[PDB]
Amino acid sequence: XXXXXXXXXXXXXXXXXXXXXXXXXXXXXXSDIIESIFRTY
Amino acid sequence: VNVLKGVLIECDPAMKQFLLYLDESNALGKKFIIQDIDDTHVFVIAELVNVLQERVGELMDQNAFS
Amino acid sequence: XXXXXXXXXXXXXXXXXXXXXXXXXXXXXXXXXXXGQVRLGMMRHLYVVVDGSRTMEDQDLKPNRLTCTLKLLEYFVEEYFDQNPISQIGIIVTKSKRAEKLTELSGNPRKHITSLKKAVDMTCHGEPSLYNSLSIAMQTLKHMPGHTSREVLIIFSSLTTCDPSNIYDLIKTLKAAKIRVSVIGLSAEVRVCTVLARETGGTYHVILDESHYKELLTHHVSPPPASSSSECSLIRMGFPQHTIXXXXXXXXXXXXXXXXXXXXXGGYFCPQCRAKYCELPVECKICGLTLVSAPHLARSYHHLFPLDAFQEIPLEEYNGERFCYGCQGELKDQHVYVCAVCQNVFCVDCDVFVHDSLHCCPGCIH
Amino acid sequence: RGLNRVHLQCRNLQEFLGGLSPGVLDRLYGHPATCLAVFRELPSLAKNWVMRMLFLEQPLPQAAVALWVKKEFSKAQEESTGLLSGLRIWHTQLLPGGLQGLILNPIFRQNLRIALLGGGKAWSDDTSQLGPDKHARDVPSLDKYAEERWEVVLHFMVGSPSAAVSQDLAQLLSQAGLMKSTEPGEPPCITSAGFQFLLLDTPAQLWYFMLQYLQTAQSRGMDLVEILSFLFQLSFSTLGKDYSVEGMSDSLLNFLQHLREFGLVFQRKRKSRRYYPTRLAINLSSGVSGAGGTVHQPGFIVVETNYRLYAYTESELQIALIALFSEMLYRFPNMVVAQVTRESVQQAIASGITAQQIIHFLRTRAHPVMLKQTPVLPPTITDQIRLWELERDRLRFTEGVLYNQFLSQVDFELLLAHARELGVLVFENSAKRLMVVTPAGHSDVKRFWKRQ
Amino acid sequence: IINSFQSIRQEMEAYTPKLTQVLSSSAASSTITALSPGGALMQXXXXXXX
Amino acid sequence: LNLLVIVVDANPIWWGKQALKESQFTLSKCIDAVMVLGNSHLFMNRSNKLAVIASHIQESRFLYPGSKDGKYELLTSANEVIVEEIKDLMTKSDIKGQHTETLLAGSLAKALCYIHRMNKEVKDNQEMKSRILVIKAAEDSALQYMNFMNVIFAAQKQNILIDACVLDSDSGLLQQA
Ligand SMILES: [Zn+2]
Ligand SMILES: [Zn+2]
Ligand SMILES: [Zn+2]
């Protein structure tokens, strides 16, 4: 249907799942986090 | 050629050279080992084989004490 | 911290025996089985949705919940294909807010149990998604024909049911798409699974033990009765005879297979398309016919002319027939079981054997 | 002990009956008890083949016997055919071309058919009429009598103050190689064969009694044939129904009262006309009592991973046996607590016990909580027992004769080839010409050297 | 029904020959001839020539 | 440890027509071949067990369950009880008209539950394998097919093998089983 027939909704801790680090100011590359921020805010 | 009717002794090489050591010390009465016919096998005078049967196990247990 | 005081004594010689017998009798229980002379859904595309949540890794069971759940699903696939041959199973692990069709809807236990032996080794990361799992199960179960009681079994553990959309429009759709969803729950009662179960048509249950969870999966093995909604059609069926290599392969038809195969000399044909199948029963891969050997209709005839109850009486009670009519043995216990129609005599071993396996009274045949 | 040590080998009724005279065998099958008793010993292939060919008067060719078996099993097939042939069941006849016909020995075949169907003899059962007998004996009291008498013999071997053996049986124990009398003012000792006899199963012990009893049956005017027919007549009898004696010779009376001394048969009086075949006499069979449990007595030794034996049985005999292969710490009126020390097993092999006796002893008396394990013993303990016996048994002795320092090398392989020719080769050399031949078979090659 | 009930009530009164009646040996020889691989009940089957 | 359960289709109408045929082969040699097979099975090993059932037209009565003439003793007692049981069964008999074709589903049901209880008798050391011989000589009624498949699937689950010697006529349900 789609990539997963939908996406992963922002459950909670979309800022604190792998917080500020795709390893503060660390790397930022996690797909769930950027898509959940794109939906959420 | 030189027909000797000794007794074959089959072991593992550790006890083979333990028998060689024990025969060099002459702890069963005579130089009871004739020659060394293999990497494994030994020859022994037939009548000291019973004192061998006791004292080899007894002296191996005595070597692990000092 | 003082459980040691649970052992009392009156004469202390058989009184410790009485306390041990009370404990050993209170550590066991009997099942609750229901009978019905009602329509059942006998062609049955069931579709199993397992959690792969974070709460699958919790150790409430003796191994973690993933391992016990998966072991009883291996037993479930075994007994369901042992009892309903026409039907099919498909397995979705629901993991990380997304749903994954782990094993497609097929009708042989080898692929499913192989996939469960694989799925022991998984990770169980993230929160589940009931939306996407019911969406994949709906997407496959739209276009099965209308006489199939299309059923989903959600073995569901966690509490945060992290959907990506609204899951009351799914329940309205699945209400209109005449599917039936039943949820077996772990550790709690969740309102959304309760609404889903009571509205789609299914049944919701929560788990105490190993034994209670086995009783629930055994309850979902049997074909559940139909609503006033499901279509009562007449599916066209095919009954292919077995065909060996005709007369020492005198003008045979050497084929490979039809779903790493060798050279098939003979076997099962199809009466619609004249293809080559090794195993029967198999839905026709290129026609849409369903192929039946017809003991596979006779393997599930006991649901239609079912058993009755045994009149259970423990006491001595007028028994002029001392021996078991089942297997010709004495009744050395105080449980005597007497049938309804013939009213012969049976013991406990004949009770469990007749009501679980043989599925008929030996008296009423005579 | 310049030979090898006394390894107690049970014959299992094949090496006994295979190795006799065929006239003795053709007399031996003259009672249906012996035909059933040799029948049940057979492997299952030979079993089914005798029951196939039983109702038949024609010598079937060799092709059908080789052609009754699927292809994969020919390695496990020729043993059954050869065992039927050597035991004088299949005597070979000829179809009138060249097909070697095979036919069952009509004495053996006729008496098996008497064992299955009606017969012309009467199994030596008799009763004039004697009803409920004066002091009729009860079945658990027959069990008690068996336990009492055979444990008295076992205590006599152990050397208790319960030495109720009546000195013909002690002479039998000295004659079979078990209790050696030395310095004849009456110490009866135990040979190492006696220690290996103790740790054995009860049907294996009784059948070893009957084998070494009939090994010296040339002494008291005994014949092997009638005694073995009476043994196989005992072990195919029933505890309940009662027998009579009328129809037996006087040497049979002497053997039956000697057998009463064994405890295998409960008499009432010496001049009586009745015997009760005891529960020891029925389970007389060349076989194994089990690996987890015994029909005689349920197992009682719990062997935990602590090398820890929990014996739930009060008996001075079995306490002495557990004292043989272990060392014992606690004794309660229900239980004995023992520990299997390395030094305890090394004492149990200094007196001479190969530790398959020990492991099978513990498997025989395995307690019913120790069951429901598929390896009924903990394999750490069992493999440790085997490693202890392999530390104790590290010398292998052989009397030989030396050939050393030959003058050439062609005569080296010539002497080696003549040794291989007459089957007297023992050990060879490749480099330094150091050969070992059999010393008893050396004089052949020695006189060959004086002939070249 | 009545004829067969009469004949089998008369039949199962006198009973048990065990040595004599059961097998003639020629029938057993013909049975071994049949179950040999070139006779009846050995259908020349399980060939499957590929 | 093995368990042969012979089932002999004692149709009195069929063997009555066979005994009025004045052939060589009557019911006496049938039940005698049954007993020689039974004594052979008990004879092959000490631990073997035997049970012999006789399907009559209206009842599944079991047949089974010193040495005067030279047999082994328990073989003699088993042969005596099988002989006396068929003499009590077939001679003292009845006559009805609506139900005259023989049955096989009920005797197989008794055999299945008998093997169940005798497998509960087995202790943990040993394990019982089992089979059911069916010696059929009559024509099976079609009317119990609904029943008959069920006992086959019970023998499918309980891992009991089924063998069949049919005497006169082929039988599709029994070769099916
Ligand atoms: Zn098709
Ligand atoms: Zn009934
Ligand atoms: Zn019963």
Numbering used by the authors:
A (entry chain C): 151 to 173, 183 to 200
B (entry chain G): 2 to 67
C (entry chain E): 16 to 274, 281 to 387
D (entry chain D): 7 to 458
E (entry chain C): 400 to 449
F (entry chain F): 8 to 72, 95 to 206
Provide the publication's sentences verbatim.
Transcription factor IIH (TFIIH) is a 10-subunit protein complex with a total molecular weight of 0.5 MDa that serves a dual role as a general transcription factor for transcription initiation by eukaryotic RNA polymerase II (Pol II), and as a DNA helicase complex in nucleotide excision DNA repair (NER). The TFIIH core complex is composed of the seven subunits XPB, XPD, p62, p52, p44, p34, and p8, and is the form of TFIIH active in DNA repair, where TFIIH serves as a DNA damage verification factor and is responsible for opening a repair bubble around damaged nucleotides. TFIIH function in transcription initiation requires the double-stranded DNA translocase activity of XPB to regulate opening of the transcription bubble, and additionally the CdK activating kinase (CAK) complex, which harbors the kinase activity of CDK7 as well as the Cyclin H and MAT1 subunits. MAT1 serves as a bridging subunit that promotes CAK subcomplex formation by interacting with Cyclin H and CDK7, recruits the CAK to the core complex by interactions with XPD and XPB, and also aids in Pol II-PIC formation by establishing interactions with the core PIC.
Here, we present the complete structure of the human TFIIH core complex in association with the CAK subunit MAT1, determined by phase plate cryo-electron microscopy (cryo-EM) at 3.7 Å resolution. Our structure of the TFIIH core complex shows its horseshoe-like overall shape, as observed in previous lower-resolution reconstructions of free and PIC-bound TFIIH, and allows us to define the complete set of inter-subunit interactions that lead to the formation of the TFIIH core complex directly from our structure. Our structure of TFIIH shows that XPD forms architectural and regulatory interactions with four other TFIIH subunits: XPB, p62, p44, and MAT1, which together form a cradle-like structure around XPD. Third, p62 residues 350–358 form a short α-helix that binds in a cleft between the two RecA-like domains of XPD, so that it not only closes the entrance to the nucleotide binding pocket in XPD RecA1, but also partially overlaps with the predicted location of the nucleotide itself, strongly suggesting a role for this p62 sequence element in XPD regulation. Second, p62 residues 266–287 are inserted into the DNA-binding cavity of XPD, in agreement with previous observations. This inserted p62 segment directly blocks a DNA-binding site on XPD RecA1 and localizes near the access path to a pore-like structure between the XPD FeS and ARCH domains. In our structure, the p52 contribution to the clutch encompasses p52 residues 306–399, which, strikingly, assume the same overall fold as the XPD NTD, as hypothesized previously, thereby forming a pseudo-symmetric dimer of structurally homologous domains. The part of this insertion resolved in our map consists of a negatively charged linker and an α-helical element that contacts XPD directly.
